[PDB]
Structures are given as C-alpha cells and as structure tokens.
Design an enzyme around this catalytic site. Structure first.
Site, PDB file in Angstrom:
ATOM      1  N   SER B  86     -30.296  -0.695 -40.153  1.00 49.83           N
ATOM      2  CA  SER B  86     -29.327  -1.768 -40.220  1.00 49.83           C
ATOM      3  C   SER B  86     -28.642  -1.843 -41.589  1.00 49.83           C
ATOM      4  O   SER B  86     -27.563  -2.406 -41.702  1.00 49.83           O
ATOM      5  CB  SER B  86     -30.009  -3.120 -39.926  1.00 49.83           C
ATOM      6  N   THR B 151     -28.217  -7.050 -42.303  1.00 50.11           N
ATOM      7  CA  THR B 151     -26.907  -7.218 -41.727  1.00 50.11           C
ATOM      8  C   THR B 151     -26.083  -8.207 -42.527  1.00 50.11           C
ATOM      9  O   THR B 151     -25.072  -7.843 -43.082  1.00 50.11           O
ATOM     10  CB  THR B 151     -27.039  -7.616 -40.260  1.00 50.11           C
ATOM     11  N   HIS B 357     -26.130  -0.165 -34.523  1.00 47.75           N
ATOM     12  CA  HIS B 357     -26.736   1.027 -33.957  1.00 47.75           C
ATOM     13  C   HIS B 357     -27.274   0.543 -32.591  1.00 47.75           C
ATOM     14  O   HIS B 357     -27.392  -0.676 -32.345  1.00 47.75           O
ATOM     15  CB  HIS B 357     -27.980   1.509 -34.735  1.00 47.75           C
TER      16      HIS B 357
HETATM   17 ZN   LIG Z   1     -29.949  -2.989 -36.946  1.00 44.17          ZN
HETATM   18 ZN   LIG Z   2     -29.820  -7.455 -38.334  1.00 42.64          ZN
HETATM   19 ZN   LIG Z   3     -34.227  -2.376 -36.170  1.00 44.74          ZN
END
Ligand SMILES: [Zn+2]
Ligand SMILES: [Zn+2]
Ligand SMILES: [Zn+2]
Ligand SMILES: *[C@@H]1O[C@H](CO)[C@@H](O)[C@H](O)[C@H]1NC(C)=O
Ligand SMILES: *[C@@H]1O[C@H](CO)[C@@H](O)[C@H](O)[C@H]1NC(C)=O
Ligand SMILES: [Zn+2]
Ligand SMILES: [Zn+2]
Ligand SMILES: [Zn+2]
Lengths: 476, 476
Positions: B86, B151, B357
């Site tokens: 991530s 993220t 992803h």
């Molecule tokens: Zn991720």
């Molecule tokens: Zn995340």
């Molecule tokens: Zn993950």
C-alpha cells in the site's frame, strides 16, 4: 534507473498521448473481433510479464492491444448462472442477447439439451456475422479450437446444446439427428455459416463419418449419418461458379492463391489444434498465420468484412491449471492482433479484443521485479514449503501428498509444460471465473467502449459503428 | 423474464446512453478520490452481487461508480516488486512516481527502513494535496484505517519505512526518533499535513504517549517522546486565529458546526476503526457519514478542494481471507461514493475511484443466478466435499484437517464473520494480488481515463484537469 524524473516523464508522455486522441466518428467497413477464451484480466497481466521475460522488458512490457486507447469492462453472468460457459457468452457478445448455460443462438426460454427449442425460430438470436451478410458484406472465422466449438459456433449456429457439434453428439443425448441439426451441419447447410468466405480451425472429425478416415491421421470420423460435409461444402461452392479450396496443413495454406480463391476451408486437426508448446510448426499454421490469410481473403470485398479470431486453448490450459501453456496460447493471440493491425487501415477497421469469461488465475506476491512469472514466489510461513507466483482458485492443481501435507512444487515441475499449478478447490477441470473481463478497442467508434457494460452490449455497439443490423446505426 | 427482446432493449438503452455522452473539457475545481485498499476487480464483482443479495436485484445490481462512463485499468507493479504494498502504490497514485516496497513519498533511490533517505529533499515526491495547497485550495483526508496508515500517509508523508507511524515504531527499527520524523509528527508539524482542513479516521494511539490514556478506552498511548500531538494540533490552529474541533465519536461529529469550523480532526478509534459488521453504530460514524462532513467543510472553499476517502479495511479482511467482512467494507465505500455524488456538482467535481492493488480473490462456478455470493458453489468431483463460490489464491484459509483431507466448510462457517474461506497457498496473512485494478471516473476530464495506464499516471491526469502542479495543465 526508474527514478523520480523517469516516472514523471513516463506519466507526462502518457498524458500527452491521451490528450492527442482523436475520435473516429465514421462508419466501420471492417470489424475484426478477437476472443481470448477464458482470458481473465489476471491472464493478461501474467501474459504481459511473460512476454516481458522474452523481450527483456519484463513488467514494463506491453500487450499489443494495450496500446489501444479504449478499454472497458464486461459483465459476464448469464440468464441462469453466475459463471458463464463459452456457449451462453458467445451468444451474448456475438448475437447481443444473454442466454442460458450451454445454449447457442437461442434466448433464455430454451431448456438446454431439449432440441425442440432449436426448432422455434421465434427464439433465435442472430449474429453479427448474419448482419454483415444481410448488408452484403463478407464473413469468416478463425480459431485454434474445433470450428464447431462454442465460440466460433456463436457466429452461425442455433442449438439447444453446445455439445451437439456433430450428429453423434445429438444421438448421445437421445435427440433425433434427422430433425435436430448439429453445429457442423448448420455451418455447411444453413446461413450464415454456408456463406462464410473463410473458415479455419480444427475439428475435422465432425465433418465425416465413422466409415471414413481422417486426412493426416487416418482416424475414423465421428458422424453416424454417412454425411461427408467437406465434400458437400466444396460441391456447393463449385455449383455456384466460385473457386474453393480445402487445406489441412501450413504449406498448403500459405500456398493458397489469394486473388483467385473465393472460399477457403482450412481444418488443421482432427480435433482442437495442438497447443503452441506442442505443435509441429511445420504442419500447423499459427494463429497469426491463419489470421493474415483470412484478412487477405476477406479484404477483397470492397464493402467490408467481419472476422472472428479466437485464441481458444487459453481456456483449455486453464481448465487443467496448465498455466505455462495458457500463457503461450495467449501470446499467440497477442501476435495475431499485431498481424491484424499491421494489415488494416484503422480509419475503417475496428479491432476489438475481449474474453468470453475469465478463469480463477491469481498473481501472488512477493517476487522481485524481473522474476519469471512462472517461478516460485517464496516460502510459506505456515508450512515452510515453496509456493508459486501464479495459482488458481479452482482446478486439478490442488494436491495433498500421501503423508498429508501440501504438495511442494519443484524446479522440474515449473518447467514441465504439463505441470498443474496449485488451486484452492480441487476439481477435475477448473471452473471458469465470474469476474468481469476486459474489452480493448481500436478504430472507428472505439470510444463506444469507455466504461462498464453487460457482455451482450458488445455487438450492438459494433453494429452501430458498422451500420449493420436492425438496431440504431451510425448511418441511420 | 430475461428474453431476447429484454436483452435487446437493455443493450440498445446502454448504447443510447453511450452515444449521449458529453465531454467535460473544463477545469476541475474539486477532486474527490476514493481508494478501496486491496479492492480487486473480483472484489468489485463480488461486492456487486453481494449488494444485489441485499436489494433483490442480484447479478443485475450495479455498484454506484459503475454508473460512471469512464473506466480504465491500472498497472500496479512498483520499482522493486511485482506485487506492490500500500505504501509504494500510494506514492504512485498520489505523488505520481513509482517507488520501492514500503516507502512513502520518496523515489526509488530509497533503501527501505534507512532513515537517511528521508532527510534528502531531492528524493521527495510531492502529493496532489501538496499541489492543491500550493494553488491555494483546501485538502483533507478520510479513512477507515489509522490516519497514519500508508494510504492516507501518501497524501502528506515522506518516510523510508511506512511502519514508522509513531516514534515508537522508529525506535523499534533502531533509527533516531529525534531526526527521523514519524508519520504522525509529519501530519501535524509539516506540510502538506499541517494545513489539511479535515483529518478523519482512526489511530489515536500514535498521537499521545505511553504515560497518557486514550479517550474512550483509557489505553496507554504508543509515543515514547512525551508528545501530545492532538493538543499541538489544536494549539496551532488557535494561534492562527482559526476555530478547530477534535471529535472522537459519531454524535460529536454530526454535531459539528460546519459554518464556523475551520479545522476538523476526528479520530474515532485508538487503532483502525472497527469493521462494518462489528462496529458500534452508535459510537462510530460510517464512511459515508465521514465523507459528508468532510465535503461540507472543504466545500466552503470557493477555490476548491481535494479530498481522499479510503475504504481501507477492505484489505485487512482479505489478508485474513475474511471475505464476508471484506465485501461489507467495500459496500460502505460504495455508499460513500453515492453520498459524494449527491453532494457535488459534476460540472466542477471529479470523482475518481480506484484501488491501490488487488487481492487474490476469485469467483468460482457454477451456482445458479440469485445464489448468495458467500454460499457454496458445489461439491468437488475429486474429493466429494463442498467448496465455496469465493476463494483465494493466498492466505490463511488453506486448511488440511487432522486426518489429512481438504477442510470442508459448513453452513455455520459460512455465516461466521470470522470464517476464513479457502486459499491455494497458505500464509499467515494473504499476499496482495499483482493483477491490474480498475479506475472509474466522473466529472471534468473523466475521459482522460479511457485505456490502460501505469498507476502513477493518475495524479498527473488529475492535476492537469484541476490545474495544479508543475506538469501540463488545462489552464496552461
Ligand atoms: Zn493496500
Ligand atoms: Zn490502506
Ligand atoms: Zn495489505
Ligand atoms: C421438450 O419441449 C417440448 C415443448 O415445446 C415438450 O413437449 C417436451 O416434453 C420437452 N422435453 C422435455 C424432456 O422437457
Ligand atoms: C543508510 O544510509 C546511509 C547514508 O548514505 C549509510 O551511511 C548507511 O550505512 C546506510 N545504512 C545501512 C545499514 O545500510
Ligand atoms: Zn470459454
Ligand atoms: Zn472458445
Ligand atoms: Zn472453459
């Protein structure tokens, strides 16, 4: 290396390309439709990396149709199943109507395996090839499977069961062959099949009887009704005053006289053509080679043509969890798309690639960049055994050893073209996968494919662009 | 029923919509970016069907963003791994540069876990939020994870290891907390974090010390440097003369005075927020609820705003192969997208949905239409035991019983929110999946997203449309 400046330039150039796109709002004269049977999005990604291993570009490589500016997603559920077969999907992306599992060219009122439904013209769905013919344009099909297999059959056939490739399959289900036309009969006796200028693939067996022997192999045919349909096909063209050639090997195919040949039937195997990694390159033409001759023939028509080309054994390899072969079949189709692009004019030719449904292929982590896609990914932290990058949600790859442990793949396994990569749920033949699949398009009205569509949308859009059929049309 | 005429009309109407599309070639004032962490295309198909099971539409259901006209694919490989984490992906879809596994906001020169690289400004990549702020526009983030998770950290942080959420994680890797700024510090003390008007999610733990106790739970904090960053954040806004509010539960969030509130920090959990199927609906705001307030706050800015919203626990559930929960997290995000659409003007707001992803989820056959997506698909023809529709290429679901057979899931298992559906390759935490993911876009210049792109392309396109940044711009 792949640093800040590198990725910024790469992105700005892609942005420049995007901004330089020009819409083609003009009629499609030609439509070439590639179908990767069972080619999931994960199959494409994997195949891309596979290709990269051959060219030395690796994860940076690109699949030929990924150069197209338009991609879209296709929803494949059918009228009775979440995960469609090849029959019902072909009915959808070639006739524009979704239908039940196992049915071809009939709507969902059909009860599979009950031939009465194939007698009722009111339940018929018509293919994009039929529409091209009604508009006075030429049609053909190319595939690596029997030419009576569900996918190519979608362009011409109407059957209550896709298993009915020849009359012996009809008999096997206890239906009456006399009135229940098998797919091979329909190809040669009924429209639109009987009008196709080009027919290529495998499946000779369905075209002559048990008493007769196969060219090449001398294997008895499967027909139980004494018909020799190849000769019927030839006699018919001759009686129309046209020139026709039947070939069964590569040399003869390459030797066909394009300018003087009206009809071409090329059946290169008794059943499905041999896979890429097993075929005799001397005796079998490759998909690109069949593709090129098809286009040469069909392109003599000054009003246009529709051609279907199927990379069909992608699916078969996936069913056996034979991922190495599946990727090789996929690249053979990838190369046929490059062949088609090199020969046609994008101002007038639509090239569309899609899949009928996917397969449960996944791409596990965490191998380094440039690792061979068919290689090991690492060692499990639960049982201390290796696991491959690629594996399956379904199939015969599931393997518990005799002493009750997870089967550990070896190096020899990985190279074995028949090795079955691990699945999560054992089945003799892997099921298909219900996930949405991709569409990629180039040429006139490629921008009709931008978002997310039902699978049966495809041919309605294509007909609009080509001005065929009884739906809405660019020429209306 | 779903007969010929029904599918013909369905297709023609989709064609009519497609042909009616109008391009929005004007500047984007606002950009709202939704990120389903680990939301593969198979997750989206499965969630769609999951949604249909709730509504009664089943396979004919539609995910809100599937109503958008532009969909595209995103290639997620990063600079050192085939299957990205991530951190490196967020650097790509938020700062425009691909990078190494575990690295945030620094280019691929970075050696992960080595803090020195986070002291070198030349290696920094800058987020779309930073670009918005340089243009004089507002920014914010909303997520279901800790607000220091990779993220959301992609919109503001620069770290050599994404594990460095708070100083105790830095110490744990034997780096020097005095000079190696953790992500929580960077959110509050550095740009662009320090200027965000809205910050919502979980992760309180990273914002106060071991000596201090959590609001709500009274759990000791994780910090080892005595810093109380929430009070630092509040003091800082106060000293600028702005009005700020810190809230930690749903009533207080919903009670916030939108017109008089300049800065809003909402941390609803010590760690990640509770999953959809476990959360106390009285104490925790939902993703849509967080989304609405964010919009209400940011949209006061007449020059526009950028907002990231993350459906983050989609990923965490898939790591545990807890597919039932994963789907529920996914619909929470699906509902937040509908909330955002209802609130904004598409003539000036870009709404873009994508994933960082995927995961190795697959959808096996062959259950009938209308079957609950979480149910059994059938019985294996190899070991005569049930298997589920949904399964995994990787994860802890792999289960060999004591007597050496394939674990057979039961009815009770299926209903159990903590049941781990089967995988093909056992691992304590499932790996991510390397397959391309979807992008779906609405509003101005949505048509910059038509084909297949590198994941880092995304923010470059979004900058062009919003007129921010130092790349090519619609306003240039
Ligand atoms: Zn991720
Ligand atoms: Zn995340
Ligand atoms: Zn993950
Ligand atoms: C086949 O269809 C016809 C009706 O049109 C019906 O009479 C016959 O019983 C059907 N066969 C079966 C076994 O369903
Ligand atoms: C971390 O990076 C620095 C700076 O260039 C270097 O001196 C050092 O040895 C690196 N640390 C390790 C363990 O590699
Ligand atoms: Zn198929
Ligand atoms: Zn096929
Ligand atoms: Zn198949």
């Amino acid at each position: 290396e792949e640093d800040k400046a590198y990725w910024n330039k790469d992105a700005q150039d892609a942005l420049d390309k995007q901004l330089g796109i020009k819409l083609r709002e003009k009629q499609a004269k030609n439509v070439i439709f590639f179908l990767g049977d069972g080619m999931s999005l994960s199959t494409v990604t994997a195949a891309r990396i596979y290709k990269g291993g051959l060219t030395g570009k690796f994860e940076r490589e690109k699949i030929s149709w990924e150069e197209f500016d338009f991609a879209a997603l296709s929803k494949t559920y059918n009228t009775d199943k979440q995960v469609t077969d090849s029959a019902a999907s072909a009915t959808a992306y070639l006739t524009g109507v979704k239908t039940n599992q196992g049915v071809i060219g009939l709507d969902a009122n059909t009860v599979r395996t009950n031939c009465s439904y194939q007698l009722d013209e009111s339940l018929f769905t018509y293919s994009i090839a039929h529409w091209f013919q009604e508009a006075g344009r030429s049609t053909g099909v190319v595939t690596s499977t029997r030419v009576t297999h569900a996918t190519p059959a979608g362009t011409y056939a109407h059957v209550a069961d896709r298993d009915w490739e020849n009359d012996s399959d009809v008999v096997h289900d206890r239906e009456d062959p006399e009135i229940c036309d098998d797919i091979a009969e329909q190809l040669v006796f009924r429209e639109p099949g009987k009008n196709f200028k080009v027919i290529m693939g495998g499946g000779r067996r369905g075209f002559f009887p048990e008493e007769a022997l196969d060219i090449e192999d001398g294997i008895p045919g499967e027909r139980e009704d004494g018909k020799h349909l190849i000769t019927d096909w030839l006699d018919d063209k001759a009686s129309q005053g046209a020139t026709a050639s039947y070939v069964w090997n590569r040399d003869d195919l390459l030797a066909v006289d394009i300018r003087n040949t009206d009809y071409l039937m090329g059946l290169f195997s008794y059943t499905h053509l041999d896979t890429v990694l097993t075929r005799d390159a001397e005796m079998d033409p490759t998909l690109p080679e069949m593709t090129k001759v098809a286009i040469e023939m069909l392109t003599k028509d000054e009003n246009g043509f529709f051609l279907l080309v199927e990379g069909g054994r992608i699916d078969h390899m996936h069913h056996a969890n034979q991922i190495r072969q599946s990727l090789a079949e996929t690249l053979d189709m990838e190369e046929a798309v490059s062949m088609a692009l090199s020969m046609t004019d994008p101002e007038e030719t639509i090239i569309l690639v899609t899949a009928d449904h996917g397969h449960t292929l996944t791409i596990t982590g965490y191998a380094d960049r440039n690792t061979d896609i068919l290689d090991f990914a690492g060692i499990s932290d639960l049982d201390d055994r290796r696991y491959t990058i690629l594996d399956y949600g379904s199939g015969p790859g599931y393997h518990i050893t005799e002493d009750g442990k997870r089967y550990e793949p070896t190096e020899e396994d990985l190279k074995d073209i028949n090795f079955r990569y691990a699945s999560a749920a054992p089945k003799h033949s892997v099921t298909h996968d219900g996930t949405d699949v991709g569409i990629w398009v180039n040429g006139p009205f490629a921008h009709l494919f931008t978002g997310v569509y039902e699978e049966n949308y495809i041919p309605h859009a294509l007909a609009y662009a080509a001005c065929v059929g009884t739906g809405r049309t660019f020429c209306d």
